[PDB]
Amino acid sequence: NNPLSGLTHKRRLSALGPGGLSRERAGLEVRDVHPSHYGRMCPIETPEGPNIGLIGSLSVYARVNPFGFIETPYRKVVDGVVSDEIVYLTADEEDRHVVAQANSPIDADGRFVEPRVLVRRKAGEVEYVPSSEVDYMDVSPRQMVSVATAMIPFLEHDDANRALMGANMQRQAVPLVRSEAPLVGTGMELRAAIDAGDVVVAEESGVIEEVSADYITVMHDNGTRRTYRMRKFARSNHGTCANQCPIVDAGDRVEAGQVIADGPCTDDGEMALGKNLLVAIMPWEGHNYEDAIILSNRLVEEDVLTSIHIEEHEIDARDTKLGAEEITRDIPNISDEVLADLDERGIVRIGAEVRDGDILVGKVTPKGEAREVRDTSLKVPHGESGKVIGIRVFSREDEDELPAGVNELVRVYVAQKRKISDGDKLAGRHGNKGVIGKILPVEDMPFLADGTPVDIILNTHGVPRRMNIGQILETHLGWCAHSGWKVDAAKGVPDWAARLPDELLEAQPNAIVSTPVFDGAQEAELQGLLSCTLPNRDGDVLVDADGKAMLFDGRSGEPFPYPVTVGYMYIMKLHHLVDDKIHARSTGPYSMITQQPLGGKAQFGGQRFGEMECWAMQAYGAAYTLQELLTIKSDDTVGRVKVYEAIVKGENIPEPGIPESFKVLLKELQSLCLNVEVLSSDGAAIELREGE
């Protein structure tokens, strides 16, 4: 789906398989967070359905023994001073030592400041010991999290369930036609993109000699020249687009290990899965009721959230006992108007716009030796379209490997561009999730004092009861980073900025910052930065010290009576699109044994009317709706046709007959040597076979 999902798939620990457990036999004690998982398994990233606790992810610093036991590093401390010697310990050796905590005040020399520290004793027992017994210490606050959980800013302010969903939903985002990096990040995004392997890096040092859209030539210092090719518009396993672009000039100097070309979800070497949008937290006329989202029309007129999806179709030409199938343009059954986009070989031409029911390749089957030719042509399935971007033909005579019994192979690739619309799923990094309820014109949107419309509106009723307050902090810090700030030090550094670095006392508009997962920006720092931000073109500060602004109403013109929270937030597009979920049917193909409608969307199938849905019908008292739903719409072979004729001619619907599944059941019971018969009011078993 994107590079993060591929990296996460390769770091998975699974408890099932040929030699382990079963989804049904597993109970409630194998799905728990043991105290010995600290530093070896992530307690947050896990599935949400029946596989909860049966699948997990390895931590960032973990490594495996020559026996199969996971280790984790620690810093040895002696005489109350932390050293810098790293020792790897297994879970069976770290329960005989007192291990301190990563977030512990450490002086310049390396002595604990607080008299007592929070440690971990033998049986995962947490205690408050005086700091003189410590024997080991953690290496970093992010030792206990995985690679996808370490990418959520302000993780310690979120509940476990919402952080779980945020980590799971970061692997379902789709690549967009243009990428841009977060305004607020964590710092893990640079080495999570190089290690994934979807970028191009230089294996040696040299200068760039030639750059185009599909190759880069680097001249090394010794004399050798190396050229790297690119994958332009390649189809991934899930139908998304994998496109690589160069980010170097024609005279740049390149060092070994530098990123040379971009990738699917990458912006200048760091992973970027979404976009920065201006938010308001307020209810709006009930269009964002119960987890819905309101968007602006500028996100459709400017291609902010647009993606390219590619599809693949095949067909096979083989021999027969009556002849040999041949691919050709000549078809004596259909007209010449629909055979205009085919070339002199029976295949479509590159650049043609196909639609539902259109023709892709033309193949005929002989019936024996003319007029023995039948029609079997590969056509676009129901509800598909797009241009044609590639054709790959394999033949037998040109020395190509082919399955025995077939003569020719051909593949056709069809691509489309999808914009954002109602029903599409959006998400954030903190657990926010909802479908788009409305798309509004840009003049119908609340706007700031200088006339800037907002881009997305989120409801305020969902934040307090779910305990994910990291999103509000993210919007505050994002506004401060977007506008830029400057701390005054005329009378010395303020009291709240004592612990800030010297490079964070001033910033430029559109700056990028980083807040690590368990050691980041405090709240005194945010509250103090919110009153230092720079003005805009005119000397006005739109957002006051609380992070709230006064907005106008775009439908009535009057100002809203109270200030509203405004900021910037990172929004990703999830791979659950409404164009792939709409379906309808009146009549179509039926089964063979039990003559009920087929199942599935690819086969033009029906919807199940299950057992639980019959109980509701029987509790309503509806005896005719159920009878019609069970006989003349599913199984009554003779009544289905008469019903169709009656509907077309405008007459009354006839009386239902008897379903076929009952007769199938009777013949099943008779085949087990059971003498089952249907009697009448006076004996004289009924034949129950029609025929008259």
Binding site: I86, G187, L190, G257
Partner: peptide
């Protein structure tokens, strides 16, 4: 950091790290 060409992303961290992932 530790990568030849990378964007400058300033950090709020107050602790130092003795190990690299």
């Amino acid at each position: 950091n530790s990568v030849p060409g990378a964007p400058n992303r300033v950090s709020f961290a107050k602790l130092r790290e003795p190990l690299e992932v």
